[PDB]
Design a protein around this ligand. Structure first.
Ligand code: CLA
Ligand code: CLA
Ligand code: CLA
Ligand code: CLA
Ligand code: CLA
Ligand code: CLA
Ligand code: CLA
Ligand code: CLA
Ligand SMILES: CC1=C(/C=C/C(C)=C/C=C/C(C)=C/C=C/C=C(C)/C=C/C=C(C)/C=C/C2=C(C)CCCC2(C)C)C(C)(C)CCC1
Ligand SMILES: CC1=C(/C=C/C(C)=C/C=CC(/C)=C/C=C/C=C(C)/C=C\C=C(C)\C=C\C2=C(C)CCCC2(C)C)C(C)(C)CCC1
Ligand SMILES: CCCCCCCCCCCCO[C@@H]1O[C@H](CO)[C@@H](O[C@H]2O[C@H](CO)[C@@H](O)[C@H](O)[C@H]2O)[C@H](O)[C@H]1O
Lengths: 75, 381
């Protein structure tokens, strides 16, 4: 990447995305990426707690993780 | 044969190349671990450990010196060839204030030709900071063909230097009595290497460099300048530039030296046009130090009675023959030091490395403040 940027080619850098950690960011309810995973999926088994519906933490926690101004699960 | 000092053995064999560690007795054992690989290059040149005779070591050192000179001539050939093929020397010769010296172009490979910067004049290359262009301008070069000729001459000298090192070891190597002739060596190096070398360079300056630089400072274009041999050939052209060349080499023998005071100047400043030292003042310097070094080369007794013996001068520098406050060095003084310095190569190398490094530092401190080449001080890189 140094030799590409120095030789005037920032586009030829090898940029590998952290897709596993981006997906773990998505399984907590981060809509920053296009991954409708567990808590990112609003009517999922994990989000709803189907028999119980007692996750009373879910709306408050997704108000904070989607809030892109705190440090909780940075992009 | 001419001095009856050679007849060296060590026949040029090829088989002795596929047996690394042949020089050391434990290095030619059989590797075993990896430390042997690193030990091979840790004392490869240490000829003192290999054998025990001083004469064989001296012969090896002499031929190694020749091979080193060959390597340096190959490097010089490469620098002159780079200035003669991959350089903007002619462009810089035209405008040496707006053109950036460059003697290296990069091949168009991966991202790689970005290092070829615009050097002025449409030349896409790398800006060299070695001072080769400023040196060639002061020596008298105007076109690249002269640089190519110098490159070919240096390559020929390199081949000649690798033949002199093979002939002075594998054919006719000197005896140890020849190496221990420090009187003769000092006489010749002081009078023939330094003295005659600076005398020959003063001749070059007076007949090639001073003409070319005078016309260059006047304003003449580099290929409008006559070639150096015309400056040597006809004295009318050279007397247009200097009016002291009309009396030829007559005022020198009749000791009328102030006649020559227009190309042997003693100004002592910087040329306002170029920025370098006064070229006439440089030529006068080389004439004076040639006369000094040649005269210094007649100091040591060699085969004719007159001279000094360094052994006598060393052995007499001792109490009570010293200055009274310098008399703390005792009644032996420097008595055993002539036998230290004529039997130890390491003692000589220690002194010569100290003086060579100190002199390189002196060179560094004298060439920023007295810039000795044209358009050198303004190229700050
Ligand atoms: C016909 C060519 C030829 C042949 C067949 C020999 C053969 C021999 N020479 Mg030699 N020699 C030659 C030319 C030759 N020489 C020339 C032209 C010189 C002048 C420099 C010498 C000066 C010389 C000395 C002083 C000595 C010999 C010795 C020897 C003998 C031992 C070989 C050895 O040490 O392994 C070495 C195998 C090598 C491949 C050596 C390679 C090193 C060379 C110089 C290249 C290194 C330069 C390097 C490339 C510079 C750039 C560095 C780079 C990293 C940037 C051997 C029989 C030695 C001896 O008698 O042993 C007891 C001895 O001390 N020679
Ligand atoms: C032993 C080598 C090694 C180690 C210590 C790590 C360590 C790490 N990787 Mg990683 N990775 C590796 C090899 C390794 N990786 C290889 C060979 C690839 C394929 C190019 C990846 C692709 C990858 C991605 C996309 C991500 C990580 C991420 C991470 C971090 C989180 C945990 C994780 O998912 O990793 C395990 C992933 C694996 C694929 C395990 C590979 C281990 C095997 C034995 C390597 C064998 C090579 C095989 C032939 C291919 C972590 C620090 C994440 C991150 O950036 O955190 C923020 C991220 O999302 N890795
Ligand atoms: C005229 C110059 C000169 C000469 C002829 C020598 C000659 C010698 N030196 Mg020496 N030396 C010199 C200058 C010189 N030195 C300078 C300027 C330094 C300061 C760095 C040293 C410090 C030094 C040490 C500490 C030692 C020697 C040793 C030796 C002996 C063996 C060299 C060897 O093993 O093979 C050649 C070795 C190499 C080619 C190693 C090259 C690897 C370098 C470090 C990388 C270079 C980086 C590159 C330029 C970029 C040999 C007689 C060794 C000895 O045992 O003496 C009896 C020894 O221990 N030298
Ligand atoms: C100190 C010695 C030295 C060094 C460091 C170089 C270095 C270089 N030379 Mg050079 N060269 C040298 C001596 C040297 N040369 C000598 C003694 C000659 C014969 C007179 C040459 C003749 C030569 C030619 C013809 C070329 C080079 C070229 C090159 C460049 C690339 C070489 C390559 O890719 O392989 C490189 C910067 C090439 C170049 O500059 O590409 C544009 C190339 O065309 N060299
Ligand atoms: C592949 C990379 C490469 C190569 C081959 C060169 C080569 C060279 N550069 Mg360059 N340079 C480079 C990268 C390179 N450069 C980069 C990335 C930069 C930054 C932009 C520069 C900036 C630069 C500047 C400013 C200058 C050079 C100069 C030079 C020349 C000086 C010779 C020398 O270094 O002594 C090296 C010594 C050796 C290699 C020891 C061996 C000597 C010979 C080969 C022994 C003979 C062996 C025998 C035949 C057996 C040489 C042709 C200088 C020049 O004057 O150009 C002509 C100059 O001023 N370079
Ligand atoms: C006036 C005669 C004379 C000249 C010009 C030389 C010149 C030289 N001697 Mg030598 N020497 C001489 C007489 C002379 N010697 C005598 C009488 C003895 C016996 C006491 C020696 C014993 C001796 C030893 C033991 C060694 C030298 C070495 C050297 C080289 C030193 C390398 C250097 O500093 O810069 C290098 C400058 C070079 C300018 C260009 C090469 C010039 C060639 C070789 C000759 C020029 C011909 C010229 C027209 C005359 C150098 C070329 C050392 C060396 O390097 O071995 C090869 C070395 O080991 N000399
Ligand atoms: C005192 C000696 C002395 C000085 C001051 C100079 C100075 C100069 N020479 Mg040089 N030269 C000399 C001796 C000297 N030369 C000898 C003995 C020879 C023959 C081997 C040459 C052959 C020569 C050539 C081929 C060229 C020059 C050129 C030049 C100019 C370029 C800059 C330079 O070399 O760095 C400055 C040097 C020094 C600061 C120290 C010089 C080192 C000498 C060898 C030490 C002599 C010891 C002596 C006792 C001096 C006292 C100690 C002192 C170091 C304090 C410059 C004005 C170049 C030019 O183009 O001219 C315009 C050029 O191409 N000279
Ligand atoms: C040591 C090197 C050297 C060499 C090879 C020459 C060679 C030459 N010089 Mg000379 N010159 C030198 C040093 C040298 N000079 C020095 C140190 C001075 C200062 C006194 C002069 C002052 C000088 C004058 C005044 C003249 C020559 C002239 C000449 C040319 C022939 C005239 C003649 O020999 O009488 C001739 C090519 C004559 C000439 O101009 O011919 C072209 C001429 O009249 N030289
Ligand atoms: C740069 C170079 C080069 C070149 C070089 C050259 C070119 C050379 C030379 C040269 C020379 C170097 C020349 C010279 C000379 C000389 C001299 C040194 C002289 C002298 C003299 C004298 C001393 C005189 C004497 C006398 C007198 C005194 C008087 C009378 C007469 C008589 C004669 C006797 C080469 C290429 C190699 C390589 C690279 C570098
Ligand atoms: C510093 C240095 C360098 C440089 C060097 C040089 C440049 C040099 C040199 C040198 C020189 C500069 C030299 C010289 C020489 C000369 C001589 C040695 C001579 C002589 C003589 C003679 C022999 C002559 C003879 C004659 C004739 C020819 C004939 C007639 C007569 C008469 C006598 C004249 C380098 C960088 C590379 C490297 C580092 C170090
Ligand atoms: C001095 C003795 C102390 C012994 C203490 C032992 C620990 C006691 C553990 C108490 C655990 C309470 O955990 C139990 O969690 C459920 C999860 O639905 C709570 O249920 C909650 O969920 C709903 C969502 O539907 C909320 O709207 C509501 O506020 C609440 O009812 C129960 O009200 C509580 O009974």
């Amino acid at each position: 990447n140094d030799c590409e940027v120095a030789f005037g080619s920032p586009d030829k850098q090898i940029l590998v995305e952290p897709v596993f950690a981006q997906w773990i960011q998505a399984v907590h309810g981060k809509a920053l990426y296009g991954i409708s995973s567990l808590l990112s999926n609003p009517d999922s088994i994990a989000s709803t707690a189907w028999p119980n519906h007692a996750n009373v933490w879910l709306p408050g926690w997704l108000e904070a993780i989607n809030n892109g101004t705190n440090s909780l699960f940075l992009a | 044969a001419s001095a009856a000092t050679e007849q060296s053995p060590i026949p040029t064999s090829f088989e002795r190349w596929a047996k690394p560690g042949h020089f050391d007795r434990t290095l030619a054992r059989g590797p075993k671990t990896t430390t042997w690989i690193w030990n091979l290059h840790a004392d490869a040149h240490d000829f003192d450990s290999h054998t025990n005779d001083l004469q064989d070591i001296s012969r090896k050192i002499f031929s190694a010196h020749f091979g080193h000179l060959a390597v340096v001539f190959v490097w010089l050939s490469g620098m002159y060839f780079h200035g003669a093929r991959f350089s903007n020397f002619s462009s810089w010769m035209a405008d040496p204030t707006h053109i950036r010296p460059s003697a290296q172009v990069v091949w168009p490979l991966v991202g790689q030709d970005i290092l070829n910067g615009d050097m002025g004049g449409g030349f896409r290359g790398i800006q060299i900071t070695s001072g080769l262009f400023q040196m060639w301008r002061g020596e008298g070069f105007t076109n690249e063909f002269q640089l190519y000729c110098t490159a070919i001459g240096a390559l020929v000298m390199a081949g000649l230097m690798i033949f002199a090192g093979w002939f002075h070891y594998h054919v006719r190597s000197p005896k140890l009595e020849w190496f221990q002739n420090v009187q003769s060596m000092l006489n010749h190096h002081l009078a023939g290497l330094l003295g005659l070398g600076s005398l020959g360079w003063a001749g070059h300056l007076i007949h090639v460099a001073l003409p070319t630089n005078k016309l260059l400072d006047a304003g003449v274009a580099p290929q409008d300048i006559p070639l150096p041999h015309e400056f040597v050939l006809d004295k009318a052209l050279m007397a247009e530039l200097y009016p002291s060349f009309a009396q030829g080499i007559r005022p020198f023998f009749t000791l009328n030296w102030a006649t020559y005071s227009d190309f042997l100047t003693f100004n002592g400043g910087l040329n306002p046009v170029t920025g370098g030292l006064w070229m006439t003042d440089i030529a006068h310097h080389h004439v004076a130090i040639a006369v000094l070094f040649i005269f210094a080369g007649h100091m040591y007794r060699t085969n004719w009675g007159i001279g000094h013996s360094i052994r006598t001068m060393l052995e007499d520098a001792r109490h009570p023959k010293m200055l009274p406050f310098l008399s703390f060095i005792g009644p032996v003084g420097h008595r055993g030091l002539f036998e230290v310095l004529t039997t130890s190569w390491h003692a000589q190398l220690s002194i010569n490395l100290a003086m060579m490094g100190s002199l390189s530092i002196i060179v560094a401190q004298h060439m920023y403040s007295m810039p000795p080449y044209p358009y050198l001080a303004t190229d700050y890189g």
